[PDB]
């Protein structure tokens, strides 16, 4: 039942920082690693994410990896740096320069072999691995490059374990580097063959959530990465705590993947609104389902209603009735049937567990698999072709040794994924 988490790149490092913060909050673990919880259940499945160290202290089953010391140090300096063991800090000293070729192909590979040995050590300490979780960017050098190398090696060693990853998706409004589409394309190409699932979160959408719904004037990554961590913890709540339905991630994978190559997901979250209105809220399941269905509360920058749904997973936290949840989610499909694909009767599946998130009575996490997602791939592929056709900046990757066909084939596979969404779309 255990999961090994790996943080790659600043994105990975900071999102994961928030993730581990939250998970320790879930179990009553203080920043020193000491358990001071509230419930027995907090310990009962603590093993998924922690090792019990002498003295009832816990160590997160996760590896922090990068090519820049400063980042790693900044994470270690904060709360929760203390909970991590020195053994999990693997890093170099010179970033990749946002170059997948440097991260994946050359330099990052040098660290990856040591990372893998630590991975192996941890998998050996585990009783039974459930899977692996990676947090990284789709556009960065170690996040997409190094991280994808690591993934190919882990899946190689553990074919039946669940490989999932959470990753930051480029947007026209975000884009930092000109070769960001190049890095994305190359990573996608690999991820589509080497993962079981990946979550596509876009900072653009996250900013909109923060202002529009959360009424923040200054969205920061500290809060943006908070929202991501909410969804990341949501997906293993049932795994960690008793409940009624679908606790296992594999069960979820079975119900969420109709076709081997379409494994990209749209996370969302409810309740997600500022405090000002919270005094007028009345959470009910219909209320949570209204917010989860609404595209504005999606973390992915994509409106599902533009495409069609293949699968929907909803995970509920806190004590709700079976009827209420199952009736209401059925009703979502009933009322919005035009946005679902007719192949699957009962497209909406639910998971329900008995432990609510600290501070809320109830909560719900949304995982969608809709053909609308192809739009995100269009943004990347399009931008790519413009660069690629002229070979602008290509020399920086050819300097590493990357072949034009390596990129060409990478594009090809991206085009395949879009076409497959279209084949299922309609």
């Amino acid at each position: 039942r255990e999961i090994v988490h790996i943080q790659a790149g600043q994105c990975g490092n900071q999102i994961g920082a928030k993730f581990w913060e939250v998970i320790s909050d879930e179990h009553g673990i203080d920043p020193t690693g000491s358990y001071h919880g509230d419930s027995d259940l907090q310990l009962e499945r603590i093993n998924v994410y922690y090792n019990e160290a002498a003295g009832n202290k816990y160590v997160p089953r996760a590896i922090l990896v990068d090519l820049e010391p400063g980042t790693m140090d900044s994470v270690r300096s904060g709360p929760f740096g203390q909970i991590f063991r020195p053994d999990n800090f693997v890093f170099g000293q010179s970033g990749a320069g946002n170059n997948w070729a440097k991260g994946h192909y050359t330099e990052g590979a040098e660290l990856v072999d040591s990372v893998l040995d630590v991975v192996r050590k941890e998998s050996e300490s585990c009783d039974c691995l459930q899977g692996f979780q990676l947090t990284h960017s789709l556009g960065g050098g170690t996040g997409s490059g190094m991280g994808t190398l690591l993934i190919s090696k882990i899946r190689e060693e553990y074919p039946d374990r669940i490989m999932n990853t959470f990753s930051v998706v480029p947007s026209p409004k975000v884009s930092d580097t000109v070769v960001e589409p190049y890095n994305a394309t190359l990573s996608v190409h690999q991820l589509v063959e080497n993962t079981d699932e990946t979550y596509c979160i876009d900072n653009e959408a996250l900013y909109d959530i923060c202002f529009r719904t959360l009424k923040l004037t200054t969205p920061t990554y500290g809060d943006l990465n908070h929202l991501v961590s909410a969804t990341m913890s949501g997906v293993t709540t049932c795994l960690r705590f008793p409940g009624q339905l679908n606790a296992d991630l594999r069960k979820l994978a079975v119900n969420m993947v109709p076709f081997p190559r379409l494994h990209f997901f749209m996370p969302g979250f409810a309740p997600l609104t500022s405090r000002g209105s919270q005094q007028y809220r009345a959470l009910t399941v219909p209320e949570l389902t209204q917010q989860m269905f609404d595209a504005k509360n999606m973390m992915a920058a994509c409106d599902p209603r533009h495409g069609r749904y293949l699968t929907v997973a909803a995970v509920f936290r806190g004590r709700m009735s079976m009827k209420e949840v199952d009736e209401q989610m059925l009703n979502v499909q009933n009322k919005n049937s035009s946005y679902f694909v007719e192949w699957i009767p009962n497209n909406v599946k639910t998971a329900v567990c008995d432990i609510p998130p600290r501070g809320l009575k109830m909560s719900a996490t949304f995982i969608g698999n809709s053909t609308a997602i192809q739009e995100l791939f269009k943004r990347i592929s399009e931008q790519f072709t413009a660069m690629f056709r002229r070979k602008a900046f290509l020399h920086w990757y050819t300097g590493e040794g990357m072949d034009e066909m390596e990129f060409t084939e990478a594009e090809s596979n991206m085009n395949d994924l879009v076409s497959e969404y279209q084949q299922y779309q309609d």
Binding site: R1, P242, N246, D248, V254, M322, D326, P345
Partner: protein, 428 residues
């Protein structure tokens, strides 16, 4: 005249949780096992502790751990709490073989232990879902082995029917169809129950706003004890499990009676109401009280059995039967003249502390073999077709070793089943 209860998966175990709680309530059993008083379901140790004759299996520890942390964990023997380390991912391939095959031998030997403990085993009852993994797939595996060593003992199965509303797996049709075939091959009688019909009863007759599985299980559990505990305790007209086989299955294949139960009335609505034997049985022939989503008025009857608890007189039953024959719309099939079997115990219905149903002085369980069951099968066939047409998710089974033809095959077997029900319904 003893029996064994087998609970597989969360559906089987959680239902079982209420079932054994009910058995405790029926005989004043303390959680510690101490009971001053049911030997068909319990054996007694020299300590005066009684132990439930049952085996609980879950390929994922989680639910069993819940059992282990509950109050009745002192009742259950540790060896009866068996768990794996990973679920079947809602998938028969794993449930039946890849994973489940690694534990099943333990399970069977614990069953044997209990079988050796019993002196005169009448049989056993199994609880599970049709759509799960462990509950369906593992169950299939289990029945394959039990029919080898026990054979002839009663194989009663209680299966949860996937509702259109609740659906928790996209490949439920596939899971269900695979299972179905094997239950056709090895069960003696299968009872499928639809949580969606149950919810309807709970919201209307029990007046419950928000039903949960815990309330749903209470209802089912009581029905199951009305069939079995009521046979064990003796009454006026005791009716054995072997008589149900003899009377409810006209042909080797028609082993799917459905259950309807009344009184299912909240305390508040029960005030003021008194139901006679006839009135309760009238409720039992109403579709609105049917625990399976189908229409009893649509189908025809082949067999019907009414079991009574508490204050019932045969004469009143005789009158009630005449009423059903005359009132109704009980089209019985020519193939069976008159087929109504009556069992009457003296044991009164019991009430669960903190329950949702009124205390009642008499209670009626309706078992029935009707052609309306085909309806449900038709719904599943269609769903299969859709999934199988695309072959969506097929790799989750095939990648675990399943053969395409296996799925085709199982569907076809169900189609044959439905057709057999048609044929029996054809009067001759």
């Amino acid at each position: 005249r003893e029996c064994i209860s087998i609970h597989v998966g969360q559906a089987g175990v959680q239902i079982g949780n209420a079932c054994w709680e009910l058995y405790c309530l029926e005989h004043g059993i303390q959680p510690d096992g101490q009971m001053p008083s049911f030997n068909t379901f319990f054996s007694e140790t020299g300590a005066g502790k009684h132990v439930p004759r049952a085996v609980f299996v879950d390929l994922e520890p989680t639910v069993i751990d819940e059992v282990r942390t509950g109050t009745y964990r002192q009742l259950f023997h540790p060896e009866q709490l068996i768990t794996g380390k990973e679920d079947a991912a809602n998938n028969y391939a794993r449930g039946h073989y890849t994973i489940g095959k690694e534990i099943i031998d333990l399970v069977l030997d614990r069953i044997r232990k209990l079988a050796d403990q019993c002196t005169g085993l009448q049989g056993f009852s199994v609880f599970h879902s049709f759509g799960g993994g462990t509950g369906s797939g593992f169950t299939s595996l289990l029945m394959e082995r039990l029919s080898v060593d026990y054979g002839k003992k009663s194989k009663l199965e209680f299966s949860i029917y996937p509702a259109p509303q609740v659906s928790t797996a996209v490949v439920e049709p596939y899971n269900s169809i695979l299972t179905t075939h094997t239950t056709l091959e090895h069960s003696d009688c299968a009872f499928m129950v639809d949580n969606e019909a149950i919810y309807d009863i709970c919201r209307r007759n029990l007046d419950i706003e928000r039903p949960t599985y815990t309330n749903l299980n209470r209802l089912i559990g009581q029905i199951v004890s009305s069939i079995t505990a009521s046979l064990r305790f003796d009454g006026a007209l005791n009716v054995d499990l072997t008589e149900f086989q003899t009377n409810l299955v006209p042909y080797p294949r028609g082993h799917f009676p459905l259950a309807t139960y009344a009184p299912v009335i909240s305390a508040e609505k029960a005030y003021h109401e008194q139901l006679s034997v006839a009135e309760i049985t009238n409720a039992c022939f109403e579709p609105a009280n049917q625990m399976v989503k189908c229409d009893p008025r649509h189908g025809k009857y082949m067999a019907c059995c009414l079991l009574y608890r508490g204050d019932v007189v045969p004469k009143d039953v005789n009158a009630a039967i005449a009423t059903i024959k005359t009132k109704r719309t009980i089209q019985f099939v020519d193939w069976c003249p008159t087929g109504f079997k009556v069992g009457i115990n003296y044991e009164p219905p019991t009430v669960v502390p903190g329950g949702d149903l009124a205390k009642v002085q008499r209670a009626v369980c309706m078992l029935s073999n009707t052609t309306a069951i085909a309806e449900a099968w038709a719904r599943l066939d269609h769903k299969f077709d859709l999934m199988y047409a695309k072959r969506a998710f097929v790799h989750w089974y095939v990648g675990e070793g399943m053969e395409e033809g296996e799925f085709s095959e199982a569907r076809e077997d169900m189609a044959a089943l439905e057709k057999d029900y048609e044929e029996v319904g054809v009067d001759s």
